[model samples]
Target chain A: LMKVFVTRRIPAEGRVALARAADCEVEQWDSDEPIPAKELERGVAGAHGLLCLLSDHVDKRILDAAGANLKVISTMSVGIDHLALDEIKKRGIRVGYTPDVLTDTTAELAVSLLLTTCRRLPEAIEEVKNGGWTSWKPLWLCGYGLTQSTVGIIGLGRIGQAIARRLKPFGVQRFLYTGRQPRPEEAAEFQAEFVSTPELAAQSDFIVVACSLTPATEGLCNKDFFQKMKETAVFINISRGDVVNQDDLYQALASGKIAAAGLDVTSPEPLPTNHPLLTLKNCVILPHIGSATHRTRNTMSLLAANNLLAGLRGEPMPSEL
Target chain B: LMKVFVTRRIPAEGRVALARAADCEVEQWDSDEPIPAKELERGVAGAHGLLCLLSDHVDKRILDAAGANLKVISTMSVGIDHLALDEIKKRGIRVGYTPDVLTDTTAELAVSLLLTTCRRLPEAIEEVKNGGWTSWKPLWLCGYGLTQSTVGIIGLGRIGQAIARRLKPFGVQRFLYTGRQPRPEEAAEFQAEFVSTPELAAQSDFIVVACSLTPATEGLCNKDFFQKMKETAVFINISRGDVVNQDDLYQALASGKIAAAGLDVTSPEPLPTNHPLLTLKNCVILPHIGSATHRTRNTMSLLAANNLLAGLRGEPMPSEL
Candidate 1:
């Protein structure tokens, strides 16, 4: 029998799929936490396929521990930075990941983060809690509304398109996008105009970074990029931490290069409590929760399971890497 | 010369208008705080017109103090419960107030309040601040989104219609309204269905109270109304506090009869810090700042001044009571 191991608890649909697969023995960790290194080593020792989350650092040690039996590695997240891709490829192990399914949820989160930061919702709530809300003053806690504002989206992929679709009704007068080649069909929906990175920086009232973190995108939103933006522009990063230069962001926010920033993904996940960015009133940091909705996550778990099951059975994986 | 007494610091545009009027001498109280009774008595002693805010209680004593000089009373707010209408008319003082100009800003605030409450924004921010956000876990703080949900508007006035226009792109499935008369033309934009108050209470996932505080709407959303709503329903009040029975609302939120509530306008403005309603995690209260934007307030002040100018000069007021 071909053995497969799931590194953490997943949706029940995946469990059922594993159970119904012929000539396969599926072992689940049965916990929400990532599998310990020792447990993962043991679990994959005799398995033909391994499923994991982004939290699991799947390096050469784990791959060598699994021996020649491991033929595939499937992740339940869009990001694959945790996996040693070169080592996995040298071992001839096929890989799989779940991606586009999370576009809507992630885009929704980006919108939420933007609104939360710009409106100063947290500060207003704190004021009420601490009795600082003296009275309804005309300009007290007043925020810059999105009406008639220009929005710049850094990428024009599925998540970026979804974000544009959602923001279209907020009376956004202009949408500028920068990507590899123009997406004319997708841009038609939002009347989005393709623009150079510098142009996007100079003209946008709100700039959202939705591009994947690759060599080209790494440190894309650096000090120079921030300097090009309007002083009142709000910046949001919802893609990955490496896409932004952390030090430049701190300087930009502290020096008032930009009005505010909302980050759902930051460099070095689980940012330390003493991070200078956290101390600023203009910065809103969330714990990398773009696709953290129950329904969407459950769907993703099932999709990842299906991909693993198909790969282990030597059939074409539903979503191949 | 005709004399006018403004109870609070009037906006700059209003001040300019009063300054330009050749036949009038305008005296404005520089303080934003409620006019002291003694000062109010002296201020209006020889005034031909009196302008005030909702915070200033315009009782018979003020009218008696004016001693037949007061010919018009203009309030710079939509609601007029603080004014004794019968007493004003009895003394031949025509009442004037700014209303429809505030509809857009108020509706926008209502929609914003609805999203903030339904999405648990404040709670999410609190978790981040208190070191509760340990990791990106699905279902941790996932609150309801507006997609595919039903919205019930308590009143189908200009503000309600404006809110419906904004909510259209959020993919709301049904728009239910409870008003004295059905507005087929206005409802066409949202494809809204007219229903009884009880039926609206039962059907909505988001119930927004946008009605005026009148005899018909007073105490409309009481215990029975709360009981009729779905357990997962969110209640939003942007109207006057008297429209809802506050005691029943507190009980509903406390018992989880409803999911949550957002109040921009509360009963007894400036609810005591120790009020039971303030302690609920599901309740979000702002200090009644619906029309509190600088630009919107400036527009309102200009409109109010125009109304006063017209009334005093016996020209038709731009907007009348």
Candidate 2:
């Protein structure tokens, strides 16, 4: 029987499927944390398949450690930058990943982050906790409301469309989207107009970036982009951190080039405690936690496991990379 | 020249407008706190116009104190329940109020309250402040997202329509609204389907109370209404406190009959700190501040001033009560 190794403790529901599957021996790390490099090499020494999360950097060393036995390498995440794709392809190994299932959950988080930052919900909660919530004053801590404002969406893909759909009820008057042309049907739903980058920057009151990080998208929001935005506009990025130039963002926020910014996925995760972005009241940075809902994450795990199982069995992976 | 007494500190811009208006002498109680009754009586002894806020109960006693010279009472608020309209009209005093100027602001607050409560933002913030933020783990602090959820709007007025417009982009599948007749024009924007109260309660994932508190709406959200809602449904009210039965709300939240509730306007303003609602984790209450934006409140004050000025000049008030 072929042996499979999972690098970390997956949800029991996902593990159960592998345990129940026929003609396979499954070994799991049994811990919630990522597998140590030494243990990972030891576990994969004779494995035919390797399953891992984004935290595991699957380079040639890991592939070589698996010897000629590994036939498949699967990641339980959408982003595959951690995996050395060229090495896997040279070894003739099939790759599997989890995608699409997280679009709604991540989009939901992006909207939540946007609202939390723009409306100053965090600041208001801080005041309540600090005992500064002395009876209500009409304009004290009152935020810029979304009603009658124009919103610009960057990367009008599945997640962007989902965000737009959620924002429709908040009275956003104009929706401008910048990216490759959106599916006509989706564009019609939101009455979203296709706009050039400069136009979107100039007119949007709330700008949301939900595109994948690629050569074209990396550092897309830079000094010129911030300069183009209305002084009062709020910028949000739920995409990878590399999509925004942190230096430019810091300058824009510190100098009041834009009103505020909300970031979920930063370029370097676990931003240092004294990062300048954290000091600004207008900038809100969350640990990369889009698609963090219980139900959705479970769905993602199950789907990812199914993909790995199918790829190992050569029966067409559910979502092939 | 007629004298006008402005209660509380009005926005400077509005105060300037009152100063510039001809044929009326304007005096302001420029303080953060409400005008003392004794001070109000002294200030309004020979006033022809009285400008006040909701906090000041403009009853018959205040009218009598202002004496026969009080030609008009212009309140810088949409809700007129604080004013004894019958007594003022009986004394041949015209009533003026600022209304439509606040529609967008109030609707914006309603949506903000709805999103915040449903997503558990305050609770999430509380967790971070209390040092509950551990390493990034999927499913931690996950709350129901608005995407693909059903929304029920109570009151299909300007504010309700505005909210529907705002929420349309968020992927809300169905909108059930209850009021008088379903407005065709507004319904077209959200594809909102009109329904009865019970139907709305049963269908909605989020129910927003946006109607004026009237004989028809008072105590509208009670035990039966709570029972009809989905166990996971969230309730938001930005209208008036009287519209919801406070005891029923407390019971529902305490019992977990409903998922959560967010209240910007409560049954009694300044609900005692020891109130049961204040003690519940599922309930989020804010001091009534729906039309609290700097720009919106400034516009409201100017509009109220303009109404008072017009009434004093024996011309049509901008917004008549």
Candidate 3:
């Protein structure tokens, strides 16, 4: 029987899929939290396949612990930030990830986060709870709206394009993007303009960071980037948190250099409650829920399970990296 | 000189416009809170025009206090629920309201509120604030997304159409709407189907109430209406709160008969802090901020002032009802 280890508990359907596989014996950490590093090494020591999550750092030490019997590693995530892809490739271990299934779900969250932040919903909700809500005053609790506004996306990939498509119906006047270059094919739909990062910051009324975290993209939104933005402009980030300098973002929101910001990803997962950004009313922080829709998560798990089973059978994986 | 009374403080631009009007003497209550009934009557005494808000109840008594000289009543809102419109019309008074200018703004809020509710943002935000946000769990904070879901709109009017347009790109599979009658011309863009209210409740994954407060719509979403909905369906109300029975909604949310609800307008403008709806985690209550964007409020105020000025000169108002 082939041995498979799941680093953490996943949806029931995924567990059922693994259980139903012929000649397969599966062991799991079986907890909502991430498996400890020591326990993870022990679980993968003699396994032929492993299903992991973003929080599990599958590094050289863990790889060594798994030995030569490890044939496949499937992650239930789109990003490969935690996996040492180079080492995995050198070891000739096949890799699988869930990508396309998460695009719409994450994009929907990006738009939702942007709207929640720019509309001042968190503060408004607090006002209602604390009895601060009074009669409607003309100038009270006013925030920016997306109508006739310019939106800039850092990476106009599948997710970025989806965001623009959803925002178009809100009467957004202009769409701007910046990355390695422009993909005119994708830009054609929204007639999106390719601009320099600085130009995007200066011109956009709302800026969305949708780019992946790579060598060239890390720390992209720093102090200088925010200094060029309109004081009334809103910022939203749904990409990896490392792409943004949290200190600069906190400063911008605190000093009113930017109107507000909403983030679903941060530098460290589970950012400490005492973080300065949490203290600012204009900065709306969400627990990383970019792909946290029930159906999407289920689909991702099923895809990951399929990828693992296919790799073990020496067949082509559904979504190989 | 024509005497005009402003029931409460308004945007500076509006105040300036009234000040610059030729042969007009403007007096204002000059507070954020609604004017007391006695004070409102005194302010309107001998006035030729009145600029009011939704918070002010302009009834027969107030009209009578104006001594047959009140020629115009301009409100910086679309709804006339707060005004005794029949009495004003009987007295040959011209009525003006800010309508078209607020359609986009209010529609934007409607969508924002819907997304916020279905996504469980308020509960998620609280989780982050109270340090309950732990490592990302596969099933933690999972929500329902707009992708490929059915949406039911109570009224397919201008604002409702705008909401559908914005939601269409999110991959909404079907649209169901119910009103006095179907207007295929307006529904063509969304390919929206006109269905009976019960059918809409039974089939929809999301239901948005955007109808006006009329004899037909008052108390529309009562217990019977909620009983027909899917257990996972979400409810949103951006129209008058009277359209929904608060006790029914609270019971539905508390009993898990409905997934969640988001309301921007409640039965009373300032719902009491101790309201049962406020106690539910699935219920997100926002103060009536449907038209509270800075630009929209300013525009509404200017339009109201212009409407009053025009009616005082026996000219047609830009938005006369």
Best by lDDT: 3
Please write out the lDDT profile of model 2 over residues B151-193, one tens digit for every residue: 9999988888878876776668999899978787878778889
Please report the TM-score between candidate 2 and the true structure.
0.87
Model 3 interface Cα RMSD in Å: 0.8
Model 1 lDDT tens row, B126-188: 666677765555446666666678999999988899888777665688999989999999998
Candidate 2 lDDT over residue span A99-136, tens digit each: 89888778778887887777776676455445555454
List the global CA lDDT of all models: 0.82, 0.82, 0.92
> Which digits, one per residue and each the tens of the lDDT, describe model 1 over residues A45-77?
978989888778899999989979999898988
Writing each residue's lDDT as its tens digit, candidate 3 over B1-321 gives 999999998998889999999789999997998899999988999999999998989999999999688999999999898889899899999999988898998999999999988887888888988988888778988889888899999999989999999999999999999998998999999999999999999999999999889889999999999999899999999999899999999999889889999999897879999999998889999999999899999999999999999999998788898
**Candidate 2 Cα outliers beyond 4 Å, as residue runs:** A6-16, A29-45, A54-56, A134-136, A168-200, A215-228, A272-276, B126-131, B179-199, B245-251, B271-281
Give the local distance difference test score of model 3.
0.92
Ranking by TM-score: 3, 1, 2
- Candidate 3 lDDT over A1-321, as tens digits, reads 988999999988888999999878999997898888999989999889999998899999889999788999999999898899899999999999998899998999899899999999999999999999988878898999989999999999999999999999999999999999879999999999999999999999999999888999999899999999999999999988899999999998899899999999897988999999999999998998889999999999999999999988999999999
Best-fitting candidate, scored by DockQ: 3
Pick out the ten consecutive residues of candidate 3 chain B with the lowest summed lDDT: B117-126
| DockQ order of candidates, top first | 3, 1, 2
